[PDB]
Ligand binder design. Structure first.
Ligand SMILES: [Zn+2]
Ligand SMILES: [Zn+2]
Ligand SMILES: [Zn+2]
Length: 81
């Protein structure tokens, strides 16, 4: 007897993700998850209503001081989990 059928499609329910590293802004980035610095990898919200990785952003502004989502004047609104 042959085998059944498999293959589960995916959706785009995952949004508002740190484009800098392309990692769940809620969780630690690939740079913090490997170094185990999650506790430090916090979420930084901007005036443009865009959450990012306090660690990434800091490194992003080094090259582009503009939100990689709306390329708008990045303004650290609030920081925290
Ligand atoms: Zn990131
Ligand atoms: Zn990080
Ligand atoms: Zn933005």
């Amino acid at each position: 007897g042959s085998s059944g059928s498999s293959g589960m499609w995916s959706w785009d329910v995952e949004c508002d993700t740190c484009a800098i590293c392309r990692v769940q802004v809620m969780d630690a980035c690939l740079r913090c998850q490997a170094e185990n610095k999650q506790e430090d990898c916090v979420v930084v919200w901007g005036e443009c209503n865009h959450s990012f990785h306090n660690c990434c952003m800091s490194l992003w502004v080094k090259q582009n001081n503009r939100c990689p989502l709306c390329q708008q004047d990045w303004v650290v609104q609030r920081i925290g989990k």
